[PDB]
């Protein structure tokens, strides 16, 4: 996968150090993130670093210019997508860890949360995939939707994350999608992508965590 558009953020260093885009381009390759002939591969140990304000490590990308630049971008300039394809071979204790999210830099709200998150659970042998949107920029909570499940360990899915530039939000995997027409208080917020593996658990043995392998992964704003 095309790394000219990421940063990212990895569990080591206190706080949570960010690679660089640059960094990230010069073949960057550690325990938490390789690229693999299968694609990309991530690795986040449940007891790994946090950033700033948050509580759970992350082995997460971010994006941005292929200046290094963070970029965050209103819906209505053009068509926005994130395209992947993964299979998950590990989880934490607690079994689910954010996968993919559109955030929101929060430039023209009070906060800087995702518009929506996806959420991969393993429940006993099978992984479902939930989408936890939230319906305006300031709203406290998000609603969840299960767009698959029957998804164990090593099987690979994929997932399609995006706004038209009309303000249509489309979310799926494997084709199995939800739909939904932004309010307008979406229209003037900073949006940007990030995929990866950012964890929702934080405690348990260094030998505990999130693993994933991303065969693909492109985004476009066309």
């Not at 395209?83 to 989880?91: C, D, G, N, P, S």
């Not at 993919?100 to 709200?109: A, F, L, T, V």
């Not at 658990?201 to 985004?219: I, K, Q, W, Y």
């Amino acid at each position: 996968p095309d790394l000219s558009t990421w940063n990212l953020t990895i569990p080591q260093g206190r706080p949570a150090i960010t690679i660089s885009t640059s960094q990230l381009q010069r073949d960057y390759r550690s325990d938490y993130f390789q690229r693999t002939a299968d694609g990309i591969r991530f690795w986040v140990p449940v007891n790994g670093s946090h950033t700033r304000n948050s509580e759970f490590p992350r082995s997460e990308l971010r994006e941005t210019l292929s200046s290094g630049r963070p970029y965050n971008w209103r819906y209505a300039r053009a068509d926005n997508w994130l395209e992947a394809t993964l299979r998950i071979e590990a989880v934490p204790s607690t079994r689910r860890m954010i996968i993919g999210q559109i955030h929101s830099d929060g430039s023209n709200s009070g906060q800087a949360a995702p518009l929506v998150k996806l959420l991969y659970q393993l429940r006993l042998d099978q992984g479902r995939v939930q989408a936890l949107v939230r319906e305006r920029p300031d709203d406290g909570g998000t609603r969840a939707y299960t767009l698959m499940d029957g998804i164990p360990l090593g099987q690979p899915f994929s997932y399609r994350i995006g706004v038209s530039r009309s303000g249509l939000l489309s979310v799926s995997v494997n084709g199995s999608a939800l739909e939904q027409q932004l309010d307008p208080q979406w229209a003037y917020q900073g949006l940007y992508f990030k995929a990866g593996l950012y964890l929702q658990d934080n405690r348990g043995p260094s030998s505990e965590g999130g693993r994933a392998t991303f065969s693909e992964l492109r985004v476009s704003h066309q």
